[PDB]
Enzyme design. Structure first.
Site, mmCIF file in Angstrom:
data_model
loop_
_atom_site.group_PDB
_atom_site.id
_atom_site.type_symbol
_atom_site.label_atom_id
_atom_site.label_comp_id
_atom_site.label_asym_id
_atom_site.label_seq_id
_atom_site.Cartn_x
_atom_site.Cartn_y
_atom_site.Cartn_z
ATOM 1 N N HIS A 39 3.197 -34.635 -4.933
ATOM 2 C CA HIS A 39 4.738 -33.805 -4.831
ATOM 3 C C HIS A 39 5.534 -34.078 -3.785
ATOM 4 C CE1 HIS A 39 7.159 -30.195 -5.777
ATOM 5 N NE2 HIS A 39 6.914 -29.824 -4.535
ATOM 6 N N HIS A 46 8.092 -32.235 -2.082
ATOM 7 C CA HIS A 46 8.425 -31.046 -2.034
ATOM 8 C C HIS A 46 9.904 -30.513 -1.569
ATOM 9 C CE1 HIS A 46 7.300 -26.778 -0.289
ATOM 10 N NE2 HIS A 46 8.561 -27.077 -0.027
ATOM 11 N N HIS A 56 3.373 -34.448 -0.299
ATOM 12 C CA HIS A 56 1.948 -33.816 0.015
ATOM 13 C C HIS A 56 1.204 -34.187 -1.281
ATOM 14 C CE1 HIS A 56 2.651 -29.758 -1.898
ATOM 15 N NE2 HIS A 56 3.648 -29.543 -1.221
ATOM 16 N N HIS A 103 -0.743 -32.862 -4.615
ATOM 17 C CA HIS A 103 -0.754 -31.699 -5.208
ATOM 18 C C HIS A 103 -1.934 -31.420 -6.339
ATOM 19 C CE1 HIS A 103 1.007 -27.859 -6.445
ATOM 20 N NE2 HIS A 103 2.277 -28.185 -5.709
ATOM 21 N N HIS A 131 2.388 -14.130 3.189
ATOM 22 C CA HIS A 131 2.294 -15.190 2.198
ATOM 23 C C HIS A 131 3.675 -16.335 1.931
ATOM 24 C CE1 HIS A 131 -1.499 -13.915 0.704
ATOM 25 N NE2 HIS A 131 -1.315 -12.689 0.889
ATOM 26 N N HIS A 152 6.678 -20.496 -2.685
ATOM 27 C CA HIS A 152 7.703 -21.701 -3.050
ATOM 28 C C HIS A 152 7.530 -21.760 -4.297
ATOM 29 C CE1 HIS A 152 8.976 -25.681 -3.000
ATOM 30 N NE2 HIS A 152 7.791 -26.208 -3.670
ATOM 31 N N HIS A 168 9.063 -24.512 -7.248
ATOM 32 C CA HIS A 168 9.229 -26.030 -7.596
ATOM 33 C C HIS A 168 10.622 -26.248 -8.435
ATOM 34 C CE1 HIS A 168 4.931 -28.166 -7.266
ATOM 35 N NE2 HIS A 168 4.876 -27.055 -6.682
ATOM 36 N N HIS A 225 4.176 -20.725 -6.159
ATOM 37 C CA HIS A 225 2.886 -20.474 -5.924
ATOM 38 C C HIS A 225 2.985 -19.996 -4.428
ATOM 39 C CE1 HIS A 225 2.618 -24.472 -3.807
ATOM 40 N NE2 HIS A 225 3.224 -24.833 -4.908
ATOM 41 N N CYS A 226 1.943 -19.510 -3.763
ATOM 42 C CA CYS A 226 1.793 -19.411 -2.469
ATOM 43 C C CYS A 226 1.612 -20.648 -1.789
ATOM 44 C CB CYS A 226 0.400 -18.434 -2.392
ATOM 45 S SG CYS A 226 0.330 -18.078 -0.312
ATOM 46 N N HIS A 227 2.231 -21.122 -0.649
ATOM 47 C CA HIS A 227 1.563 -22.352 -0.058
ATOM 48 C C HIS A 227 0.848 -22.415 1.203
ATOM 49 C CE1 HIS A 227 2.802 -26.540 0.367
ATOM 50 N NE2 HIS A 227 4.034 -26.502 -0.542
ATOM 51 N N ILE A 228 0.169 -21.344 1.347
ATOM 52 C CA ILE A 228 -1.155 -21.620 1.750
ATOM 53 C C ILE A 228 -2.085 -21.937 0.806
ATOM 54 C CG2 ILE A 228 -3.112 -19.794 3.004
ATOM 55 C CD1 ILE A 228 -0.828 -18.217 3.661
ATOM 56 N N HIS A 235 -4.881 -20.314 -0.773
ATOM 57 C CA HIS A 235 -4.448 -19.252 -1.822
ATOM 58 C C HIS A 235 -4.390 -19.754 -3.075
ATOM 59 C CE1 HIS A 235 -3.514 -16.250 1.903
ATOM 60 N NE2 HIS A 235 -4.770 -16.871 1.917
ATOM 61 N N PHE A 283 -3.325 -18.176 -6.775
ATOM 62 C CA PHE A 283 -2.052 -17.358 -6.435
ATOM 63 C C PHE A 283 -0.895 -18.200 -6.866
ATOM 64 C CE2 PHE A 283 -0.628 -14.149 -2.973
ATOM 65 C CZ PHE A 283 -0.217 -13.220 -3.879
HETATM 66 CU CU LIG Z 1 -0.955 -16.819 0.249
HETATM 67 CU CU LIG Z 2 4.683 -28.137 -1.558
HETATM 68 CU CU LIG Z 3 7.452 -28.172 -4.190
#
Ligand SMILES: [Cu+2]
Ligand SMILES: [Cu+2]
Ligand SMILES: [Cu+2]
Ligand SMILES: *[C@@H]1O[C@H](CO)[C@@H](O[C@@H]2O[C@H](CO)[C@@H](O[C@@H]3O[C@H](CO)[C@@H](O)[C@H](O)[C@@H]3O)[C@H](O)[C@H]2NC(C)=O)[C@H](O)[C@H]1NC(C)=O
Ligand SMILES: *[C@@H]1O[C@H](CO)[C@@H](O[C@@H]2O[C@H](CO)[C@@H](O[C@@H]3O[C@H](CO)[C@@H](O)[C@H](O)[C@@H]3O)[C@H](O)[C@H]2NC(C)=O)[C@H](O)[C@H]1NC(C)=O
Ligand code: NA
Length: 499
Positions: free
Chosen positions: A65, A67, A110, A112, A397, A400, A402, A452-455, A458, A463
């Site tokens: 992806h 980002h 990164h 995905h 949290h 993010h 897309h 989604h959460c970007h941790i 998670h 998430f």
């Molecule tokens: Cu999170």
């Molecule tokens: Cu990302």
């Molecule tokens: Cu993204």
């Protein structure tokens, strides 16, 4: 050197020792972080990704992806596995062929798939502006002025328990740093500057989890870009940067020639700087080659606060100046229990057929789409509001979206919304208990966009949700190349999956 906008990129396994401890990794371009992919605003990027992975302990499939890049008309190139494509299998390659109209700033790329980016597949992605409105504020802007902040684990990602609070073993600045336990005096990164010059430092969180308190002893930092969006100048002495966010700041090399500590304190893992953990070195040309002796202050007097940021352009805020003042006002119920996260009562588990392929095959509405309850349709050409009230364990949290950036109408730790001039960005901390961080955007980009959460731990624990934006126009808007249509048959054949 930087690569792109047209380049091959090989994804391999190799041993690396960025903190003095050797472990196998998943690498782009043979390095951690991967090489910087770069071009100018509006360029055609064609990144032909060669999947050369053979170690199953980190997964031999992959997907990448880009980002923060919107992918308008090229949803198929966005990269999230089982949302916009099936993974690339080993010994095969895939050309991510897209354009970047109307965007210029600091991004990253990164893996995905699953938690594979934690195992190493992460690097910078910079879209320069030949007519940058901020160009006169600095002298130097190049590969030497990118600063990446990364968490690094000794345990392989596929051995991390799902839904667990997983902790890192080192902070890496520009790929180097020291381990929190069994600390050895392994090499620290050096960022070199010349007395009197001004630098566009492009600060990129490539974190899988922690946020960092970033500062530079003796120096302050003048923010001019937030997640790709030009900002008014904001001078700070510390930046709390959450996973996947980016800032450009002007560093004025206006202190005495010498060595100064660069500090990145994570919210979890090792606290402080003993033995040179959480550290890198700012070295002025002409300084002695030795470690800095500088001190941090006990408290930072001018920390970044998100509500202080404002766009350089008159971006305003879409909709009306009150809660729910949008065509499609949403409030997500974000929760955690028993190792799994959920959004609106559903924990995300990737479907067998990617969401985009389901839509191209004729799926008529969000209730026809899988995973059931994980896809929300958005109407076209409409103002969307999404309130993201915090509380779920494992905060804060960073959420993010897309395909979009968004106005941050309400920020962490402050109950007052801003319908006039908030910053726009693509990844936002939703704060703490009782907060109501809220985002707005307009729907002018048909396709399925992951939220989604970007941790990354998670996301793996569920998430996430998919916004199926303008289902009716998705097929006409996103013509797909044969190589993309070949990906799911190849992947399912290789894994003995029927569909
Ligand atoms: Cu999170
Ligand atoms: Cu990302
Ligand atoms: Cu993204
Ligand atoms: C964050 O802000 C959102 C708005 O952006 C708040 O949403 C509002 O939530 C309330 C209840 O919490 C909603 O009212 C309820 O509606 C149902 C009918 O749908 C009714 O049965 C209940 O008695 C109650 O009236 C409201 O629709 C919704 N939107 C608004 C006011 O625009 C949310 O509460 C905020 N969260 C936090 C933690 O501050
Ligand atoms: C909590 O968030 C709110 C909303 O983002 C922040 O409120 C905003 O504060 C700014 C800075 O004080 C206000 O702008 C000021 O307005 C006048 C011009 O009208 C100007 O003379 C000042 O120099 C500055 O422009 C802004 O109006 C205000 N907005 C709202 C909706 O209240 C607030 O500062 C944040 N709290 C903290 C502790 O940072
Ligand atoms: Na407006």
């Amino acid at each position: 050197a930087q690569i792109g906008p047209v380049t091959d990129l090989h994804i391999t396994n190799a041993n690396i020792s960025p903190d003095g401890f050797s472990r196998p990794a998943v690498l782009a371009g043979g390095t951690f972080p991967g090489p910087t992919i770069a071009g100018n605003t509006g360029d055609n990027f064609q990144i032909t990704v060669f999947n050369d992975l053979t170690d199953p302990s980190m997964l031999t499939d992959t997907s990448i992806h880009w980002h923060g890049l919107f992918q308008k008309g090229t949803n198929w190139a966005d990269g999230p596995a089982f949302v916009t494509q099936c993974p690339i299998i080993t010994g095969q390659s895939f050309d991510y062929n897209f354009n970047v109209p109307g965007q210029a700033g600091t991004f990253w790329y990164h893996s995905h798939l699953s938690t594979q980016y934690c195992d190493g597949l992460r690097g910078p992605f910079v879209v320069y502006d030949p007519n940058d409105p901020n160009a006169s504020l600095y002298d130097v802007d190049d590969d030497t002025t990118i600063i990446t902040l990364a968490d690094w684990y000794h345990t392989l990602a596929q051995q991390e328990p799902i839904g667990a609070a997983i902790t890192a073993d080192a902070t890496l600045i520009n790929g180097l740093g020291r381990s929190f336990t069994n600390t050895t005096a392994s090499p620290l990164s050096v960022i070199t500057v010349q007395s009197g010059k001004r630098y566009r430092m492009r600060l990129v969180s490539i974190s899988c989890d922690p946020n960092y308190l970033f500062s530079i002893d003796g120096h302050d930092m003048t923010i001019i870009e937030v997640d790709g969006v030009n900002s008014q100048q904001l001078t700070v002495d510390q930046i709390q940067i959450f996973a996947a966010q980016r800032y450009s700041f002007v560093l004025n090399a206006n202190q005495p020639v010498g060595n100064y500590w660069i500090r990145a304190q994570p919210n979890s893992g090792g606290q402080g700087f003993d033995g040179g953990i959480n550290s890198a070195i700012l070295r002025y040309e002409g300084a002695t080659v030795e470690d800095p002796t500088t001190t941090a202050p006990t408290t930072f007097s001018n920390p970044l606060v998100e509500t202080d940021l404002h766009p350089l352009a008159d971006l305003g805020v879409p909709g009306q100046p009150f809660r729910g003042g949008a065509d499609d006002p949403l409030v997500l119920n974000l929760a955690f229990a028993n190792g799994r996260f959920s959004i609106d009562g559903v924990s995300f588990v990737p479907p067998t057929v990617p969401v985009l392929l389901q839509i191209l095959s004729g799926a008529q509405n969000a209730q026809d789409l899988l995973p059931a309850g994980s896809v929300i349709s958005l109407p076209s050409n409409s103002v969307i509001e999404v309130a993201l009230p915090a509380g779920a364990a494992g905060g804060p949290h960073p959420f993010h979206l897309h395909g979009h950036n968004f106005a941050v109408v309400q920020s962490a730790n402050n109950a007052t919304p801003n319908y006039v001039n908030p910053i726009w960005r693509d990844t936002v901390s939703i704060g703490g208990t009782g907060d109501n961080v809220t985002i707005r955007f307009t729907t002018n980009n048909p396709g399925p966009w992951f939220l989604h959460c970007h941790i990354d731990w998670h996301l793996e624990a569920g998430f996430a949700i998919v916004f199926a934006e303008d289902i009716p126009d998705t097929a006409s808007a996103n013509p797909v190349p044969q190589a993309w249509s070949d990906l799911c048959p190849a992947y399912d054949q290789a894994h003995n999956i029927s569909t």
